[PDB]
């Protein structure tokens, strides 16, 4: 600022300008931001009558371009990042030329040895750039921080201002300036504070501990503190798998100054943060779509046989049961989750129960779903050692003296839960599920907390017949061994049989041998665009079908093998709506109701 820039800085700038001149992808992107802000500014300014100023750099573009500048960011970021942002802050002034703040950087890619788990983040290579992967373990209450303070000198109507700097605003150890908050003017007058002409920024620290499946298990966790400036504050939450990049500063002067041992305070200045996805995580896969990927979906969406092949392509590892995995595919699609005006929300999620002879795929099918649903969590049921899959214990020692944490089902707020060995799971959870299933709300009433939290999520149940095996010559209710309301709460109950034979059993050997000796990645991208864009309204061509069938089964099935209730009316709507989503249909059609009937014919008879 006040000192005269030396060539060791002036070069770094103009050298970085030849990079951005070469890779226009960044020059047009910063422009694309001030396109967006001015459209909103015009929207605010010119109808009533932002994006947080950072760019991600692919480090692959530096390696081939400027080898010593590659090593500079990694080995000496404090001498190479402040000038690169100083270039961009004048590139931004070059792209715009409308009338009239900082601009900042972020990175992506491979850092070699410098990407390491906090198990091996050590007091070697402190100042170097680092990447760390792990669980975000807690987050601090996002405090506002002072930078500029503003005052009024009422004797004159002048305004005065003061500006603050500290250990976390520059990578280099700027000379400290412990300035004093001005309660009196230089002349001696009184002052008052113009709160909100002053400016503020969010401070947060989050503490990351090593990812538990890579961890050499048995050892203790080890964790380090990451400080986030204004931007990334909103994009971390405890328990998610997170990668951070930053500078592992070693600040203060403990021991050697003041008096006495424990060494320097070590932390990362977070300049990039990404959530990432791993098994049983609180975030979706969220694959990006090209304008090409959408083209393939639209080629498919009007072919009159996709649902049969798509239903099959799920699980080549398993033979048969197309009639079931049809429905599990429909669970990924779900309903429309209609929320009514001045009256309570109405369920969209379809919840499925699998039961059958213990030889079957019940435990294995769920590891397709858990591996290929957008968001899923798996629970054993018995072994939910907290309150359950939903609620949690609540206590604190930190400054606020209370905190909350969420169970699996509150974390899985929209997606999937895999529940298996379902009838092991005790009444304490089952009666809590009766709260959830058709209300999708959770209530607790501890000493301090008396409040309602959402759980708009979908369930697979897997169960075993209590007698060890079942066959249809034994009356078909008592084998279910659950309260009749749960047999209502779950929407489709499928009974899988293997009283052995030979004819079908013949083919199985060569299919398994072929299995030891359409595809998955498109389904995710097929489902999410369908989920995001498509919201089928009903159509009269199908509203009659759901009345004909539902009204007949209550005459027939109440004289036969299964119960029928007004609960199973709406399950017809959801399943019809789901198949229309498979069609990407802007509206429901009669064919979807005929499919809804078919799935229940197989499930009931």
Ligand X SMILES: Nc1ncnc2c1ncn2[C@@H]1O[C@H](COP(=O)(O)OP(=O)(O)O)[C@@H](O)[C@H]1O
Query: Among residues 53 and 347, whose Cβ is nearest to ligand X?
Result: 347
* 402 SS3 class: coil
Is 71 known to sit in a ligand binding site? no
Q: Within 541-600, which residues bind ligand X (CB under 6 A)? A: 566-567
Q: Which of 134, 270, 282, 465 binds other proteins (CB under 8 A)?
A: 282
359 marked as part of a ligand binding site: yes
CA dihedral angle for residue 583, residue 589, residue 593, residue 595, rounded to 10 degrees: -30
* 363 labeled binding residue: yes
State the binding string over 221-250 for other proteins (x if CB under 8 A, else -).
Answer: -x----x---------x-x---------xx
What are the angstrom distances between the C-alpha of 505 and each of 147, 313, 314, 332, 500? Answer: 75, 21, 22, 30, 8
CB of 59 to other proteins, least distance (A): 21
Determine, following the binding rule CB under 6 A, whether residue 360 of this chain makes contact with ligand X.
yes
- Vertex 425, ends 419 and 426: CA angle to 5°? 150
Q: Which stretch binds other proteins (CB under 8 A): 85-93, 209-217, 493-501, 528-536?
A: 209-217
522: its two tokens: 């498109």
The enclosing H or E element of 490 equals none
Q: What's the rounded Cα separation, in Å, for the pair 75 and 87?
A: 20
Q: Which of residues 404-463 bind other proteins (CB under 8 A)?
A: 404-408, 410-411, 413-414, 418, 420-421, 424, 427-428, 431-432, 434-435, 438-439, 443-454
Nearest CB to other proteins, comparing residues 426 and 598? 426
164 binds other proteins (CB under 8 A): yes
Site track 473-502 with other proteins (rule: CB under 8 A), x = hit: ----------xxx--x--------------
Q: Is residue 29 a contact partner of residue 36, using CB atoms and an 8 Å limit?
A: no
Residues forming beta bridges with residue 441, ordered by sequence position:
454
CB distance 148 to 199 below 8 Å: yes
How far CA 254 is from CA of 171, 257, 258, in Å, comes to 19, 6, 7
Residue pair 347/568 in contact (Cβ under 8 Å)? The answer is no
The interface partner of residue 582, options being other proteins, ligand X, none and the CB cut-off 5 to 8 Å by kind, is none
Q: Which of residues 329-358 bind ligand X (CB under 6 A)?
A: 346-347, 358
Using CB under 8 A as the binding rule, the residues of this chain from 578 to 597 that contact other proteins are none
Residues 123, 266 contacting (CB under 8 angstroms)? yes
Q: Tell me if 358 is assigned to a ligand binding site.
A: yes
Of 189-197, 314-322, 334-342, 403-411, which part binds ligand X (CB under 6 A)? 314-322
Number of residues that bind ligand X (CB under 6 A): 16
What does the per-residue mask of binding to ligand X show for 273-312, with x meaning CB under 6 A? ----------------------------------------
The reply on whether position 362 binds ligand X by CB under 6 A is yes
Long-range contacts of 160-164 (CB under 8 A, 24+ apart): 160/185, 160/191
CB 525: neighbour CB atoms within 10 A? 18
Q: Least distance in Å: CB of 60 to ligand X?
A: 42
Rg (CA), the chain: 30
Closest CA to 270 of 318, 311, 231: 231
Site residues, ligand X (CB under 6 A): 318-320, 346-347, 358-364, 438, 485, 566-567
- Can you say which residues are annotated as belonging to the binding site for ATP? 356-363
């Amino acid at each position: 600022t006040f000192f005269a820039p030396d060539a060791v800085f002036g070069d770094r700038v103009r050298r970085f300008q030849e990079f951005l001149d070469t890779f226009t992808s960044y020059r047009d992107s910063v422009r694309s931001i001030q396109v967006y802000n001015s459209n909103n500014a015009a929207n605010y300014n010119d109808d009533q009558d932002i994006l947080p100023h950072r760019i991600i750099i692919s480090l692959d573009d530096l390696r081939e371009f400027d080898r010593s500048f590659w090593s500079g960011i990694l080995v000496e970021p404090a001498y190479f990042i402040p000038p690169a942002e100083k270039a961009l802050t004048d590139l931004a002034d070059s792209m715009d030329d409308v009338p009239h703040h900082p601009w900042k950087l972020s990175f992506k890619g491979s850092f070699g040895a410098h990407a390491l788990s906090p198990r091996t983040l050590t007091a070697q290579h402190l100042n170097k750039l680092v990447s760390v992967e792990g669980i975000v373990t807690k987050t601090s209450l996002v405090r506002p921080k002072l930078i500029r303070s503003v005052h009024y000198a009422a004797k004159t109507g002048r305004f005065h201002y003061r500006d603050y700097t500290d250990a976390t605003t520059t990578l280099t150890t700027r000379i400290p300036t412990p300035a004093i908050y001005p309660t009196e003017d230089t002349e001696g007058n009184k002052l008052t504070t113009e709160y909100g002409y002053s400016t503020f920024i969010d401070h947060q620290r989050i503490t990351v501990q090593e990812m538990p499946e890579m961890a050499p298990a048995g050892q203790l966790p080890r964790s380090i503190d990451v400080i986030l400036d204004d931007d990334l504050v909103d994009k971390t939450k405890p328990g998610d798998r997170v990668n951070v990049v930053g500078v592992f500063k070693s600040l203060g002067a403990g021991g050697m100054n003041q008096s006495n041992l424990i060494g320097f305070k070590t932390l990362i200045l977070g300049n990039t943060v990404y959530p990432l996805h791993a098994r049983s995580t609180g975030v979706a896969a969220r694959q990006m779509l090209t304008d090409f990927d959408i083209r393939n979906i639209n080629k498919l969406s009007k072919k009159k046989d996709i649902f049969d092949i798509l239903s099959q392509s799920l699980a080549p590892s398993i033979y048969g049961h197309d009639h079931i995995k049809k429905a599990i595919l429909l669970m990924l699609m779900g309903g429309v989750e209609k929320n009514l005006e001045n009256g309570s929300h109405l369920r969209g999620d379809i919840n499925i129960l699998m039961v059958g002879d213990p030889s079957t795929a019940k435990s294995q099918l769920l590891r397709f779903v858990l591996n290929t649903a957008s968001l899923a969590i798996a629970t054993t049921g018995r072994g939910s050692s907290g309150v359950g899959l939903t609620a949690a214990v609540t206590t604190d020692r930190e400054t606020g003296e209370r905190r909350l944490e969420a169970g699996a089902m509150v974390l899985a707020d929209r997606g999937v839960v895999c529940i298996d060995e379902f009838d092991k799971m005790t009444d304490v959870d089952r009666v809590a599920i009766h709260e959830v299933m058709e209300q999708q709300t959770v209530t607790i009433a501890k000493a301090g907390i008396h409040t309602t939290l959402n759980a708009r999520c979908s369930v697979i149940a897997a169960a075993n017949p209590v007698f060890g095996q079942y066959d249809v010559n034994r009356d078909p209710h008592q084998n279910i061994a659950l309260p009749d309301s749960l047999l209502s709460r779950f929407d489709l109950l499928f009974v899988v049989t293997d009283d052995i034979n030979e004819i079908r059993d013949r083919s199985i050997s060569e299919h398994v041998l072929r299995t030891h000796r359409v595809t998955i990645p498109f389904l995710r991208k097929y489902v999410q665009y369908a989920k995001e864009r498509v919201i089928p309204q009903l159509t009269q061509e199908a509203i009659n079908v759901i009345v004909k069938n539902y009204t007949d089964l209550r005459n027939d099935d109440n004289t036969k093998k299964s119960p029928i209730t007004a609960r199973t009316l709406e399950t017809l709507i959801r399943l019809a709506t789901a198949h229309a989503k498979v069609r990407l249909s802007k509206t429901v059609n009669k064919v979807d109701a005929k499919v809804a009937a078919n799935l229940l014919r197989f499930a009931l008879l």
